[PDB]
Design a protein around this ligand. Structure first.
Ligand SMILES: CC(=O)N[C@@H]1[C@@H](O[C@H](C)C(=O)O)[C@H](O)[C@@H](COP(=O)(O)O)O[C@H]1O
Ligand SMILES: CC(=O)N[C@@H]1[C@@H](O[C@H](C)C(=O)O)[C@H](O)[C@@H](COP(=O)(O)O)O[C@H]1O
Ligand SMILES: CC(=O)N[C@@H]1[C@@H](O[C@H](C)C(=O)O)[C@H](O)[C@@H](COP(=O)(O)O)O[C@H]1O
Ligand SMILES: CC(=O)N[C@@H]1[C@@H](O[C@H](C)C(=O)O)[C@H](O)[C@@H](COP(=O)(O)O)O[C@H]1O
Lengths: 191, 191, 191, 191
């Protein structure tokens, strides 16, 4: 039976398992440290390709709304130019499930060479990106069916980036709320 | 207690409830019809703003990989120009949780005027977009905490678009698999 | 003397020379043929990276407004997935000054393998892209100063894409004017 | 006679006149001041829609390569969220030929309210954007034919942004050259 109802049920369970297995690997003390490192960055570059780039863009819009200076761009050659322009104290959040896309590895190498802090969000595998990162947060898609592998992967990745966002709101709550209110007031003027 | 572990646990449950409540509203017979309508479209425009635009882009990349001709662009004025260029038999997938963003409503009005079929992916509310759509698929975020409302909304929206994608693969399985293989072979050449 | 007034004067002359030298190479009979080929394409993919991707996007928005079904995306891995999904009769407009960016060459190889027609917009050099293209339109930046090389290159590239756009309007003038009017009416509703 | 050769000749002359008429309005002392203001900005937001957004993106990529922290995004609601997050000393470069697109005016109002410096790049008309800007740089398309109005407008706009870029390179030449070299070395590794 391959009805749409069966497909939906199996996909929801697949996503639940990705959330659970990703959450199970978190070191919460290490996560609080990473959040503090991000909060101090004068500039944050979020890198990625394909589905990882969309996860990165999703995080980037939220961070920009609450006042962070963020670079996040799909063009891989532009991404490389930003990575080499990073400074000590800046942060790169490198989102790559495989950790082995040449463009993203190159951006991480360039960021690290400039003295920036590299935080990888990547699968539980021994990848070039994991070897370059100062800190790694793990994303586990679980055992997925081929038609939905990319969707459960994205679900797992968003569980990590979403938690980073909430942690950053927690650290600067008053200003975050002020910026959320100003943003809502502005977009309502476009109704 | 507002520790990161508590936050992660509550957020995962919030997402689970969004998946469940969205799934509970599906009319599977109506969904199969919508999938067939999409499969026949010579051109598909996926519209949206903000987080909905990212959900749309996520679907657009998958549909393009399996051979669909898709327009999906963030610039709202460009979106309007595409909507008025649609033809009878083309499909607009209008993604808007509120269903009341002026730009997205305008695009749906323009598409409908040209004779295109409008499928709305929207919250369970009485919005201008829902009144313009030929078919509506409901997305329910559930009762969310303010720090994560947009994330659970996105989770609910992706549950609908992901199901559309799997349904479309199901309808043209051989060609979808061929295109997935060619795509994987090409990107591996960029390693 | 390196005053801003001197810089502006020299840059305008550099752009004038790029327009002139690019125009001087055009075979107008071959250009009319290319325009006809584009006009018949059920789907057009415009590829490119960096500055060439922006030139491509600029053309893509105009073509979409006048009714063409166009793919144009910065992410190089997404571009590859679109190229392998092209069909016989579809057209790829491959914009690359060097003609030797691996990602763009790969997209042209994939498009040609599927039977699509490849039109390269590229410098007057013996590049892999020029060897893969069914038709090539030349772009000459001229001898440029290092601070403005990319700007005069873009000027030369836009001179070719702009001419393609005008030629396509010429071929379907009534419908183009109708679509321009509908588009203007819609965007004015967002004032 | 409406041959492609005649069209190309007329379009090149139209672009030459746009460059000339835009250049003729520059106050070079005021321009040097604007360049200095930009050079000191901890964060720069470049706003715009449609063709102006592409001009902005073109400038943004160059500024990011030479070390500036820049926001530049097509989604108008995201643009609004960035504008309200700007700080005193930050700069908004608001690119709008008409100066009367509601979204761009709103972003300029929000930036000014936060204490940021607003530099408008706009036509020689009495627009809401010109009334909000601390400094305005004029862009003149000249008298254009309807098929090419947007192209000559873009040419005029790029003449201003290109001059800003060269002026900024001039102010920090050693670091700009270092960043250009690192960027070229990195992208060559992707060949
Ligand atoms: C054809 C292919 O395989 N494209 C992949 C992307 O997969 C997408 C979801 C897909 O399957 O259509 C992947 O998101 C991206 C980043 O991958 P990663 O850095 O997250 O490991 O790389 C690309 O080559
Ligand atoms: C400041 C604001 O409210 N921006 C909203 C977007 O919310 C985002 C996630 C946010 O909160 O930062 C919303 O995704 C978009 C489409 O909304 P919708 O069409 O899905 O209802 O509209 C925008 O105005
Ligand atoms: C650091 C570098 O060199 N980036 C280049 C891009 O140059 C841009 C304008 C630049 O200088 O910052 C180039 O537009 C793109 C496509 O090049 P092409 O396909 O048009 O030849 O390739 C990228 O690697
Ligand atoms: C249908 C329409 O008119 N779209 C316009 C855009 O024109 C484009 C080039 C076009 O004609 O297709 C314009 O670039 C943008 C910003 O305009 P501006 O802020 O530079 O004045 O506004 C949009 O509404």
């Amino acid at each position: 039976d391959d009805s749409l109802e069966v497909i939906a049920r199996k996909l929801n369970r697949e996503k639940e398992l990705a959330l659970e297995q990703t959450c199970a690997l978190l070191d919460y003390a290490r996560l609080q440290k990473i959040i503090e490192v991000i909060s101090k960055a004068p500039f944050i570059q979020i890198t990625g390709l394909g589905g990882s780039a969309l996860v990165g863009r999703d995080l980037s819009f939220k961070l920009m709304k609450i006042g962070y200076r963020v670079a996040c761009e799909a063009d891989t050659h532009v991404q490389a130019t930003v990575s080499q322009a990073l400074k000590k104290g800046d942060v790169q959040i490198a989102i790559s499930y495989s950790g082995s896309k040449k463009e993203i590895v190159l951006c991480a190498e360039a960021a690290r060479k400039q003295g920036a802090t590299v935080i990888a969000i990547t699968s539980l595998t021994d990848s070039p990106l994991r070897r370059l990162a100062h800190f790694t947060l793990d994303t586990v898609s679980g055992e997925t069916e081929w038609r939905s592998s990319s969707m459960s992967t994205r679900t797992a990745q968003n569980s990590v980036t979403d938690l980073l966002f909430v942690g950053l709101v927690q650290l600067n709550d008053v200003e975050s709320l002020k910026m959320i209110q100003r943003s809502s007031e502005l977009t309502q003027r476009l109704k």
